[PDB]
Design a protein around this ligand. Structure first.
Ligand SMILES: Nc1nc2c(ncn2[C@@H]2O[C@H](COP(=O)(O)OP(=O)(O)OP(=O)(O)O)[C@@H](O)[C@H]2O)c(=O)[nH]1
Ligand SMILES: Nc1ncnc2c1ncn2[C@@H]1O[C@H](COP(=O)(O)OP(=O)(O)CP(=O)(O)O)[C@@H](O)[C@H]1O
Ligand SMILES: Nc1nc2c(ncn2[C@@H]2O[C@H](COP(=O)(O)OP(=O)(O)O)[C@@H](O)[C@H]2O)c(=O)[nH]1
Ligand SMILES: CC(C)N(C)c1ncnc2c1cnn2C
Ligand SMILES: [Ca+2]
Ligand SMILES: [Ca+2]
Ligand SMILES: [Ca+2]
Ligand SMILES: [Mg+2]
Ligand SMILES: [Mg+2]
Ligand SMILES: [Mg+2]
Lengths: 348, 54, 425, 438
């Protein structure tokens, strides 16, 4: 009989995993403060990793990698890419980004303005976006004055003024991919992705209305007036998106986009493997990640951000959550296909 | 990767490598704590004997 | 040299105590005449814990036999190992206690208690460093119950900083001598709540059910019940009488088993308990599952009705200590809903290479469980069924007691039950 | 030459002390009778080994050691053991009944009645020292004596030897090898009252020693003898600089200078490699790089924790055996480019290296195989705060219910000392977080 504890009641994902575990009649849920557990479905913030792997006779597993925040934080991701030789400062698939601390608090203010003036003088498209843990402007004065009005660290990166627009609609979009890393640090890519499409036509002469530029499911379902017109819930799955690329661009989702996506996921996760791996550790880790990608009109993929506690598409909850139990949990605590994941081999 | 202060003798040697530069209660007070705790023990035992005498 | 002074009082106390010294004497190689005839140094490593050494290499138990009538102790002096006891350590009267707590505690018993303490003082004066005392007795009668708790009260007055443990047989209507047993047990329990550090609660009904249901004994006798108590008493004293990687005296044991001063009433158990399919080797999983099974427990309380504050398990015999930790860590990690989560690692295990007589290996269970409140609930309910009508009270008021003292014993008991209730939620 | 006095308190301290002096004797060529054939100065001398051994006119080399226990059974093994001849009776002190795992009993009740005796016996050893450096104090966190009496002794030593350094070797409680439930109380009580009196403390978590004995030595259920033989190797690696010719960590003061820039944060993490099973057919000898790389594997640390998620304040590499500086620096460079070694910004990113050519001595019939080279890394990481966190959490669970508190109050301790001690630990945990996290 395997035991587990739930410490994040708000996780829609592991709420289903906890629902499945009990359905096998071989896992037992304990009070959230009971230390005699095999599996911890831990909290998002301040997870006490130091209290794991110290119960005699219990092999303990947790659904978060200690140290993965370096990748799942806006400012941290920028620093990692610029300071990690595995990614270098000339990393071709990450938009030019800079870490900018508000004046009321190292900082890359001067470096940003240097590349800014370079674009403004060279007639180049000089539109950037500011965000933290949103403002889209073509003038650096507005971008910097907006960060000083807050109090947290922000990041300014180049804005993709040439996004790939779906037709009909002439509308922006982003690609979400779910990646599961198990205790052996195998990188699995869920075969099912989702495009969160903007139901509004992309407009490059007015960044004031952020409804056609931000493809977040909450903004489209709150500030957009064409929600659910072209696809149900502004969510296009791979089957349709792939069929579209064939009819329109005469290419496939695998060739045109997925190869770059798999390459980016590998580079990011292999880079931090020495720092977060639980191979020789007294406890084991696994984590589900949500990568957000952008595609330009040249069919080049760009990494937007990585989410450490992602949500799933309603249609793909059962399949993915079951897949988490198959490779992430039962692989360590076995029970008494055609896998849904794509193993991204690599050198450890 | 510098080596500094290298010292060698018959039974070994020692050195320093720098990869990067940087960026009470008196005796009287103890007696009071000890005696204070002894007094509380005496008080507790006296209340036990008084209880047993009742 | 951490000596323990043993005291047995009353009929039950002396019949159970007699068998106890019979059992452990065999384990230490002491014959009925006090002469050692073992074959292992482990039998003498800690022999002085329970035995004095007289001239001629004779070992005399450090035991004091108390009773208000001669009968039961005349039987001991004529029993198997009767000759092994110090003749001066028999202290007895002639009147009896008539199964009356007031007689044991206030009238008949008071006339005899001084001479009992004279012997106790004699045994203590001869101890290098006295660990503490252990008293065997029943709570349903008059001598072991009323005078036993009187003895405890006076031993505590003269040795306030020594450990006082008891093996206390709780009465049950199914195995009962008189109808006043709830009165006597309720009056005693309050004494034990105040003046003992550890009380092993032994329920005669549980001893009966084990002899009938598990042991398949059609009509159990008191001798059959006492066989279970002997084996259990030998088990709980194993890590006191033999050398091992555990250096624990009575005080260190109490410190780790009693988180709250008044909640010091333990459920003991034993395994195996096989009916005569008796030569079958018992595996470690079977020992562990049985030792935690209620049917192997002697307090007649279902542990699943409460929560364990602390648990101690002692394994005897040659076995896989690695395999012990696995099964033990399997019971806890398979039923952690019955252990309190606010005492980390409250389940401890001890090993002993010397198994009991006629067993390849055994396990003794010692649990401080809040389920013991059910035992005090039964007693309280029987007490109140009679006391509300003042039934049989005249036996006690005729000895000088007042009804107020009964009302106070009732409240103290119900407060005890209330204290267990809060630590179970 | 300056002398070092070792003090062993409680069962854990005494048995560990017994295993270390066995190892010391094998290392210095001292026989159980105290004789040392290679010591050509009879009855005198100021050599490096004289920091730990005095000499009688008859040539006996007597440890500068005091053993203390509130119960006699553990110290009786020393009196009748193999090395009974080393010590004289004045060095062995035993009470009648122990502290019963009760800090208050060892600190107040019993300690108050034996403290002056211990100081007298220590004063005797001090009077033999021409230049006493300080003290090495061995004890457990969990025992009533090791916790309670140790803190009292440390307070008095600070009064009687104000200008002397005091180092600790403390055994952190592990449930797998303990039958006690109140050890979290004792650990936190003794750390609170000892903090301002210890200049440097090497915590060894029994859980780590236990797993190393099962993983590397193939001991299915290690005993205290197994644990103590491994612990005495690590202790020997740490004290070798005081007992052998050298230039690194030549006196107790240097341990604080090289390992503790902030006084309260004085708990270095110890890592040791390699630990090879003697029963093995024959192991392949590991290189300087491989054993140095092993110093950054959690599996060989004396306290299980993750230094990748802390910051270093200092780092010492202590090699024994066939090691030349060239190979040390080469392996270090390789580790920097591979490992997560983040230093605090107000401290240099460096490594002090000491090499002793004599390889680790192994006790005949022991569990450890003879190796050609070994290393012990002493690093001061904020990661060791994980051990304080674990311990403080267990404390909170029991103290929320006042479980077992009556045993301590009953011995004369005020309940307030529980909260005063816990709040001191809360501040110690805050100190680590200010030095390590960003
Ligand atoms: N590594 C190691 N740990 C030990 C040893 N002896 C005891 N311990 C640990 O110490 C703790 C118990 O404290 P002890 O040192 O035995 O007790 P004490 O200091 O003698 O104090 P008392 O309560 O008076 O007995 C437990 O955590 C044990 O695991 C030993 O020889 N080696
Ligand atoms: N450099 C850039 N160029 C073009 N569009 C960008 C961009 N950075 C962000 N976006 C837009 O913003 C959206 C993603 O915003 P971001 O991910 O930073 O906010 P967020 O993290 O709160 C949403 P979530 O984490 O849930 O995916 C995408 O839909 C994308 O269209
Ligand atoms: N287990 C056991 N219980 C007994 C024995 N003798 C009496 N009892 C129980 O003890 C109670 C009677 O007390 P008893 O010891 O005979 O009275 P006392 O001689 O005045 O102390 C009743 O509950 C009996 O069931 C015995 O030999 N073994
Ligand atoms: C303190 C407990 C858990 N321990 C280790 C014990 N071990 C063996 N026999 C014991 C005890 C306690 N009582 N008795 C009779
Ligand atoms: Ca009379
Ligand atoms: Ca000399
Ligand atoms: Ca000081
Ligand atoms: Mg996000
Ligand atoms: Mg009778
Ligand atoms: Mg001890």
């Amino acid at each position: 009989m395997y035991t587990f504890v739930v410490r994040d009641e708000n996780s829609s994902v592991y709420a289903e995993v906890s629902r499945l575990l009990l359905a096998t009649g071989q896992w037992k849920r304990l009070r959230k403060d009971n230390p005699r557990f095999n599996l911890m479905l831990g909290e998002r913030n301040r997870l006490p990793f130091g209290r794991l792997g110290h119960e005699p006779g219990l092999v303990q597993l947790v659904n978060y990698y200690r140290g993965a925040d370096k990748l799942c934080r806006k400012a941290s991701l920028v620093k990692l890419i610029k300071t990690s030789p595995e990614l270098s400062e000339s990393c071709t698939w990450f938009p030019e980004s800079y870490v900018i601390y508000p004046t009321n608090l190292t900082d890359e203010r001067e470096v940003f303005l240097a590349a800014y003036n370079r674009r403004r003088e060279g007639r180049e498209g000089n539109v950037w976006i500011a965000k933290s843990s949103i403002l889209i402007s073509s003038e650096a004065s507005e971008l910097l004055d907006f960060i000083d009005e807050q109090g947290q660290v922000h990041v300014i990166q180049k804005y993709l003024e040439k996004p790939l627009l779906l037709e009909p609609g002439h509308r922006k979009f982003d690609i979400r991919s779910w990646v599961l890393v198990d205790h052996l640090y195998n990188i699995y890519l869920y075969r099912e992705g989702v495009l969160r499409t903007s139901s509004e036509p992309y407009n490059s002469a007015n960044f004031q209305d952020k409804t056609c530029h931000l493809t977040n499911h909450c903004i489209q379902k709150e500030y957009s007036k064409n929600y659910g017109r072209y696809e149900e819930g502004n969510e296009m799955f791979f089957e349709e998106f792939n069929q579209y690329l064939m009819d329109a661009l005469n290419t496939t989702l695998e060739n045109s986009i997925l190869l770059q996506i798999k390459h980016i996921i590998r580079s990011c996760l292999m880079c931090i493997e020495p720092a977060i791996s639980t191979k020789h550790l007294h406890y084991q880790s696994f984590q589900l990640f949500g990568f957000d990608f952008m595609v330009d009109e040249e069919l080049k993929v760009w990494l937007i951000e990585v989410n450490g506690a992602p949500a799933c598409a309603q249609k793909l909850y059962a399949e993915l959550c079951q897949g988490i139990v198959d490779v992430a949990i039962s692989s360590v605590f076995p029970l008494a296909p055609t896998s849904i994941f794509i193993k991204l081999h690599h050198h450890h | 990767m510098e080596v500094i202060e290298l010292n060698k003798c018959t039974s070994g040697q020692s050195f320093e490598v720098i990869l990067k530069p940087p960026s009470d209660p008196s005796l009287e007070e103890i007696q009071k704590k000890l005696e204070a705790a002894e007094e509380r023990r005496k008080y507790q035992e006296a209340e036990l004997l008084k209880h047993l005498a009742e | 040299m951490r000596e323990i002074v043993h005291i047995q009082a009353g009929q039950c106390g002396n019949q159970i105590g007699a068998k106890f010294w019979e059992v452990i004497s065999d384990e230490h190689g002491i014959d009925p005449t006090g002469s050692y005839h073992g074959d292992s140094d482990l039998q003498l490593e800690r022999i002085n814990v329970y035995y004095n050494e007289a001239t001629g290499n004779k070992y005399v138990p450090r035991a004091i036999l108390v009773d208000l009538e001669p009968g039961t102790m005349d039987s001991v002096r004529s029993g198997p190992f009767g000759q092994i006891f110090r003749p001066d350590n028999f202290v007895f009267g002639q009147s009896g206690a008539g199964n009356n707590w007031a007689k044991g505690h206030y009238t008949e018993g008071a006339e005899l208690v001084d001479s009992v303490l004279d012997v106790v003082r004699k045994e203590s004066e001869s101890c290098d460093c006295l660990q503490g005392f252990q008293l065997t007795h029943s709570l349903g009668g008059g001598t072991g119950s009323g005078m036993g708790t009187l003895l405890i009260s006076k031993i505590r007055e003269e040795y306030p900083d020594r450990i006082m443990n008891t093996f206390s047989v709780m009465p049950s209507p199914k195995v009962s001598d008189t109808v006043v047993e709830p009165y006597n047990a309720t009056l005693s329990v309050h004494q034990l709540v105040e003046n003992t550090d550890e009380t092993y609660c032994i329920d005669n009904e549980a001893l009966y059910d084990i002899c009938f249901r598990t042991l398949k004994l059609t009509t159990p006798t008191y001798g059959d019940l006492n066989h279970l108590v002997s084996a259990t008493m030998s088990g709980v004293t194993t890590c006191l009488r033999f050398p091992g990687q555990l250096n624990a005296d009575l005080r260190k044991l109490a410190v780790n088993m009693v988180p709250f001063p008044r909640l010091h009433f333990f459920m003991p158990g034993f395994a195996p308990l096989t009916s005569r399919q008796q030569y079958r080797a018992l595996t470690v999983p079977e020992l562990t599952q049985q030792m935690f099974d209620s049917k192997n427990m002697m307090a007649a309380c279902d542990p699943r009705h409460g929560r364990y504050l602390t648990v101690a398990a002692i394994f005897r015999g040659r076995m896989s200590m690695k395999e012990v930790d696995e099964q033990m860590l399997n019971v806890q990690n398979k039923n952690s809903s019955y252990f309190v989560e606010w005492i980390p690692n409250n389940v401890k295990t001890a090993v002993c290479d010397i198994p009991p007589r006629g067993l390849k290996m055994s396990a003794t269970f010692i649990g401080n469980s809040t389920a013991i409140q059910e035992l005090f609930k039964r007693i309280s309910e029987q007490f109140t069924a009679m006391f509300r009508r003042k039934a049989f009270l005249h036996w006690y008021t005729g000895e000088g007691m007042d009804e107020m003292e009964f009302t106070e014993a009732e409240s103290n008991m119900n407060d005890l039950v209330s204290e267990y209730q809060q630590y179970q939620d | 030459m300056r002398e070092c006095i070792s003090i062993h308190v409680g069962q854990a301290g005494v048995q560990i002390g017994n295993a270390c002096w066995e190892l010391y004797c094998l290392e210095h060529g001292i026989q159980p009778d105290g004789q040392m054939p290679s010591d050509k100065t009879i009855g005198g001398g100021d050599d490096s080994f004289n920091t730990f051994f005095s000499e009688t006119g008859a040539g006996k080399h007597v440890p500068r050691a005091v053993f203390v226990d509130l119960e006699p059974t553990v110290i009786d093994e020393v009196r009748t053991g193999t090395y009974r001849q080393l010590f004289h009776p004045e060095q062995l002190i035993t009470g009648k009944e122990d502290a019963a795992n009760n800090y208050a009993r060892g600190h107040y009740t019993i300690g108050k009645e034996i403290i002056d005796l211990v100081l007298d016996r220590i004063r005797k050893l001090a009077d033999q020292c021409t230049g006493l450096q300080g003290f090495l104090v061995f004890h457990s966190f969990g025992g009533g004596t090791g916790s309670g009496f140790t803190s009292l002794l440390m307070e008095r030593l600070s009064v009687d030897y104000g200008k002397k350094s005091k180092l600790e070797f403390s055994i952190y409680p592990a449930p797998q090898v303990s039958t006690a439930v109140v050890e979290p109380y004792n650990s936190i009580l003794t750390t609170h009252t000892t903090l301002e009196h210890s200049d440097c403390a090497f915590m060894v978590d029994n859980e780590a020693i236990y797993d190393i004995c099962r993983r590397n030595l193939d001991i299915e259920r290690p005993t205290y003898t197994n644990l103590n033989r491994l612990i005495s190797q690590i202790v020997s690696s740490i004290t070798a600089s005081l007992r052998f010719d050298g230039a690194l960590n030549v006196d107790l003061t240097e341990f604080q200078t090289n390992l503790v820039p902030y006084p309260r944060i004085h708990f270095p993490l110890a890592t040791y490699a390699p630990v090879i099973s003697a029963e093995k057919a024959y192991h392949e000898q590991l290189s300087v790089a491989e054993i140095t790389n092993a110093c950054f594997e959690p599996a060989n640390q004396m306290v299980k924790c993750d230094p990748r998620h802390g910051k270093y304040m200092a780092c010492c590499l202590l090699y024994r055996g066939d090691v030349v500086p060239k190979d040390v620096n080469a392996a270090i460079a390789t580790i920097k480019t591979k490992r997560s070694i983040q230093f605090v910004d107000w401290c240099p990113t460096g490594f002090k290296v000491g090499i002793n050519y004599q390889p680790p001595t192994v006790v005949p019939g022991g569990d450890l195989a003879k190796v050609q080279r070994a290393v012990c890394m002493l690093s001061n990481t904020t990661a060791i705060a994980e051990a304080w966190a674990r311990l403080d959490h267990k404390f909170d669970l029991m103290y929320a219910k006042r479980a077992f508190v009556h045993w301590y109050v009953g011995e004369g301790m005020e309940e307030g000392e529980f909260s005063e001690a816990r709040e001191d630990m809360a501040a110690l945990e805050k100190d680590y977080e200010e030095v390590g996290v960003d």
